[PDB]
Amino acid sequence: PREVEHFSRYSPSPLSMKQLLDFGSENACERTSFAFLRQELPVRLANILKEIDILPTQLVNTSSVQLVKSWYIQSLMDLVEFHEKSPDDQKALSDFVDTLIKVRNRHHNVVPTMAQGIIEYKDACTVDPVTNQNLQYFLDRFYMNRISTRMLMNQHILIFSTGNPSHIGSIDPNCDVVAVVQDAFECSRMLCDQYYLSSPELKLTQVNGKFPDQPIHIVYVPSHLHHMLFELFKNAMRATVEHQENQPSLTPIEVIVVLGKEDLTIKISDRGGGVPLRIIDRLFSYTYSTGFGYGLPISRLYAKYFQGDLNLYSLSGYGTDAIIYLKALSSESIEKLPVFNKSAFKHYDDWCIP
Amino acid sequence: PVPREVEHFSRYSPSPLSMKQLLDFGSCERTSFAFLRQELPVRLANILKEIDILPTQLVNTSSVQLVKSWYIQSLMDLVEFHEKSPDDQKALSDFVDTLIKVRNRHHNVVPTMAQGIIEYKTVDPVTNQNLQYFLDRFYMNRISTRMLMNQHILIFSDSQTGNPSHIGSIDPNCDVVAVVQDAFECSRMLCDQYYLSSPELKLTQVNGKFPDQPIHIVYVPSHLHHMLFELFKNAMRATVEHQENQPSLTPIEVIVVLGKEDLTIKISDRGGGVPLRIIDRLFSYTYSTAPTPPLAGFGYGLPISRLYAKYFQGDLNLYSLSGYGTDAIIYLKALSSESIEKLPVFNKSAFKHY
Ligand SMILES: Nc1ncnc2c1ncn2[C@@H]1O[C@H](COP(=O)(O)OP(=O)(O)O)[C@@H](O)[C@H]1O
Ligand SMILES: Nc1ncnc2c1ncn2[C@@H]1O[C@H](COP(=O)(O)OP(=O)(O)O)[C@@H](O)[C@H]1O
Ligand SMILES: [Mg+2]
Ligand SMILES: [Mg+2]
The missing domain is CATH 3.30.565.10 (Histidine kinase-like ATPase, C-terminal domain)
Structure with a gap:
C-alpha cells in the first residue's frame, strides 16, 4: 500500500551500541524511544519490503514469501498507527509496548518461513549463477534487517515493559x-x-x-x-x-x-x-x-x-x-x-x- | 601513441597454461616456438593497452615511459619471428637468443615501475584503487611472461640449463x-x-x-x-x-x-x-x-x-x-x-x- 512506498523513501538510521546504552541506562526516556521507533521501524520494514518485490517471481509467489511479506506489511501498518498518537498519551506508550510484543511474536517465525521459500524455490527451479548470487545478497540483507529490528524493539520492550537487571x-x-x-x-x-x-x-x-x-x-x-x-x-x-x-x-x-x-x-x-x-x-x-x-x-x-x-x-x-x-x-x-x-x-x- | 602491432595483438585473449602443460613440453622446440612467438606479443600488447590508459601524469614518468618502450621493442623483436618456419633451426636458435635478450631487457622492469610510482607521488598510491588494480595486473603479467620465456630458455638453450632436477x-x-x-x-x-x-x-x-x-x-x-x-x-x-x-x-x-x-x-x-x-x-x-628506506x-x-x-x-x-x-x-x-x-x-x- 501507500505507506510501504512512502517510508521506503527514508533510509534507515543506524545506532551505535553506545547510543543504545547512553539511552536507556540512566535517562531512559520512554517518550523519546517511542517517537524514535514509531518512525524507524516502519522505515526499515518498508525498505526491505521494497527489496522483496525485486526477487524472482516464482520465489515471491511462494506461500512462504507471501507470508513474510504480509506479516511485514501488517506490522508496518500497526506501527504507523501510532504517528497519530502523542508521545505524552500513556495509553499510547503502553499500547506501543504491546504492539511491539505482538510484532515480535508475529516475526518469531520469519527466518524459517523465508528459509523455506528459498529451499522451495531452489529445489523447484533452475537458477542462473547471477540469480543465486542475488539470493545470497538478498538474504544477508533481509536477515540483517530482521536482526536490527529485533534488536531495537527488544531494547524498548525489555527496558519499558524486563529481563536481566545487570x-x-x-x-x-x-x-x-x-x-x-x-x-x-x-x-x-x-x-x-x-x-x-x-x-x-x-x-x-x-x-x-x-x-x-x-x-x-x-x-x-x-x-x-x-x-x-x-x-x-x-x-x-x-x-x-x-x-x-x-x-x-x-x-x-x-x-x-x-x-x-x-x-x-x-x-x-x-x-x-x-x-x-x-x-x-x-x-x-x-x-x-x-x-x-x-x-x-x-x-x-x-x-x-x-x-x-x-x-x-x-x-x-x-x-x-x-x-x-x-x-x-x-x-x-x-x-x-x-x-x-x-x-x-x-x-x-x-x-x-x- | 600506440603502434599498429600493439593494437592488433591486444585484440586477443592470453591463453592460460597449466603447470602440467608447462611440465610437458619439457618431456618439442618447434611447438613451443610456434606458441610463444604468438602468445608473448598477445600478453605484452594486452598490458601495453592498460598502461596506455594509466594516469597521464604516471604514464609520463621516465620510468613508465621507459618500461613501455621496452615492452614495445620486445613485442616487435618477437613479431619479427612470425615469418620464419618453426622447423628453421637458425630461427629456433635465434629465437632462444631473443628470449634471453628480452628477459635481460625486462630484468629491471619491477624496480623501474616501482620507482615511477615514487615519482608519481602529486597523489596517494595506497588509496588510489585504480593504481592498485593496475599494479596487480601489470606484475602478474610480468610474472607470467618471465615464466613462459624462462621455461623455453632453460629447456632449449645451449648455455642456460638451470637446475638439472x-x-x-x-x-x-x-x-x-x-x-x-x-x-x-x-x-x-x-x-x-x-x-x-x-x-x-x-x-x-x-x-x-x-x-x-x-x-x-x-x-x-x-x-x-x-x-x-x-x-x-x-x-x-x-x-x-x-x-x-x-x-x-x-x-x-x-x-x-x-x-x-x-x-x-x-x-x-x-x-x-x-x-x-x-x-x-x-x-x-x-x-x-616502517619508514621507506632492506627488511621493510x-x-x-x-x-x-x-x-x-x-x-x-x-x-x-x-x-x-x-x-x-x-x-x-x-x-x-x-x-x-x-x-x-x-x-x-x-x-x-x-x-x-x-
Ligand atoms: N570447523 C569446520 N570443519 C569442517 N567443515 C566445517 C566447519 N565449519 C563448517 N563446516 C562445513 O561447512 C558447512 C556449513 O555449516 P553451517 O553453515 O553451519 O550449516 P550446517 O551446520 O547445518 O551444516 C557444514 O555442513 C560443513 O560441511
Ligand atoms: N606478521 C605480521 N604481523 C604484524 N604486522 C604485519 C605482518 N605482516 C605484515 N604486517 C604489516 O603490514 C605491512 C605490510 O607488509 P609488506 O606489504 O610486506 O611491506 P613492508 O614489509 O615493506 O612493510 C607491514 O609494514 C606491517 O606493518
Ligand atoms: Mg552449524
Ligand atoms: Mg615484508
Whole structure:
C-alpha cells in the first residue's frame, strides 16, 4: 500500500551500541524511544519490503514469501498507527509496548518461513549463477534487517515493559567474553555427547593486550555472541568427531580470546580435517550443508551487525580456524544496515578463468 | 601513441597454461616456438593497452615511459619471428637468443615501475584503487611472461640449463619443507642484521594425502621461496619489535599440510597483530608501517607474494589477532593439472573497472 512506498523513501538510521546504552541506562526516556521507533521501524520494514518485490517471481509467489511479506506489511501498518498518537498519551506508550510484543511474536517465525521459500524455490527451479548470487545478497540483507529490528524493539520492550537487571535491555555493558565462550561450548558439548556419546574438550586461553592482567570485558549483546560461538562450536565438534571416527580420543577444540586496542578477536581451532579452498565460500551459502546451513551465514551477520566480522580459514587434511572479530569500543559498534536505494537496485571477464 | 602491432595483438585473449602443460613440453622446440612467438606479443600488447590508459601524469614518468618502450621493442623483436618456419633451426636458435635478450631487457622492469610510482607521488598510491588494480595486473603479467620465456630458455638453450632436477623452473618433486627451512634461513640472516636476533622456527607437517610420506608437489620453488621469504620477514620484524621487553623470543610456528586438493602452509607469530581495520591496507602496494628506506618499507612484500600464490590458482591470506599475533596462510593447488595461469585480459570489463 501507500505507506510501504512512502517510508521506503527514508533510509534507515543506524545506532551505535553506545547510543543504545547512553539511552536507556540512566535517562531512559520512554517518550523519546517511542517517537524514535514509531518512525524507524516502519522505515526499515518498508525498505526491505521494497527489496522483496525485486526477487524472482516464482520465489515471491511462494506461500512462504507471501507470508513474510504480509506479516511485514501488517506490522508496518500497526506501527504507523501510532504517528497519530502523542508521545505524552500513556495509553499510547503502553499500547506501543504491546504492539511491539505482538510484532515480535508475529516475526518469531520469519527466518524459517523465508528459509523455506528459498529451499522451495531452489529445489523447484533452475537458477542462473547471477540469480543465486542475488539470493545470497538478498538474504544477508533481509536477515540483517530482521536482526536490527529485533534488536531495537527488544531494547524498548525489555527496558519499558524486563529481563536481566545487570543488563540494559539485551546489552551487557560488561560482557564477560570468556564466560560466554564456556557457556556456548557447553550447549554444544551437550548436543555432541547426546548424539555421538563423545565430544572434544575445550582448551581456552586469553590475552588482554590492553591491561595484561585484566579479565576481558566489552560492551556487547551476549545473546548475539552466544549464537555465533554456539554455531562455530557445533561445526568444530561435528568435524572433529567425524574426522577422528577411528580414534580413541578427540583432539581438543582450542580457543583463544584476545582484546586489543580496537578489536576483540576469538579464534576457534579444530583438527577436524578442514575443507578444500575450493569449497570454503560455499560454506557461507545459505543452502549448503553436508540442521540447515544457516549457521555460518547468520553467525557472520551477527558479527557484522556492529561492524565486526567472521572468517573461516582451513588447512584441508588437518583442521579449521574460525575467527570472530568484534569492535572493542562501543562508539564504533554501529549498526550495519541495508538501505534500498539506487546503489542497491543497481546491484541486483576481468581475468582469465579456468 | 600506440603502434599498429600493439593494437592488433591486444585484440586477443592470453591463453592460460597449466603447470602440467608447462611440465610437458619439457618431456618439442618447434611447438613451443610456434606458441610463444604468438602468445608473448598477445600478453605484452594486452598490458601495453592498460598502461596506455594509466594516469597521464604516471604514464609520463621516465620510468613508465621507459618500461613501455621496452615492452614495445620486445613485442616487435618477437613479431619479427612470425615469418620464419618453426622447423628453421637458425630461427629456433635465434629465437632462444631473443628470449634471453628480452628477459635481460625486462630484468629491471619491477624496480623501474616501482620507482615511477615514487615519482608519481602529486597523489596517494595506497588509496588510489585504480593504481592498485593496475599494479596487480601489470606484475602478474610480468610474472607470467618471465615464466613462459624462462621455461623455453632453460629447456632449449645451449648455455642456460638451470637446475638439472628441474624441468625449466619447475620442480616436479618440490620438497616444500626444504624450501620453508631455506626461506626461513634467509629471513633469519636479514633479521639478525637489523636486530642482532631473530625468532626460531618451529615446524610441523601433516601429509593427509600420503600419510607419513614427505610432502611433494609440482611447483616453481623460486616462487614459493619468494612468498615464504616475504612472510617470514614480516613475522620476524613483528615478533622482535613486539617482544623486545621479554627475555626471549617466541618462535615462529609453521605448519605444512598436504590435502587432497590443496597444499596449505600456515605461518603463525606472536608479534602483536594488527587491527582488522588496516588488514586490507596491508596488501596495498607501498603500504608500510616502517619508514621507506632492506627488511621493510617499500610495502611490496604482501601484494607480490599474494600474486605468486594466485598466479597458479592458489591464494594468500592474513588473519590477525590484534594484541597477540598474526596467522599468514598460503594455499597452493596440489594437482599440477589444476594449477592454471591466472592472467589479466584487457577488454570491455577491464576497461569498465578504471
Ligand atoms: N570447523 C569446520 N570443519 C569442517 N567443515 C566445517 C566447519 N565449519 C563448517 N563446516 C562445513 O561447512 C558447512 C556449513 O555449516 P553451517 O553453515 O553451519 O550449516 P550446517 O551446520 O547445518 O551444516 C557444514 O555442513 C560443513 O560441511
Ligand atoms: N606478521 C605480521 N604481523 C604484524 N604486522 C604485519 C605482518 N605482516 C605484515 N604486517 C604489516 O603490514 C605491512 C605490510 O607488509 P609488506 O606489504 O610486506 O611491506 P613492508 O614489509 O615493506 O612493510 C607491514 O609494514 C606491517 O606493518
Ligand atoms: Mg552449524
Ligand atoms: Mg615484508
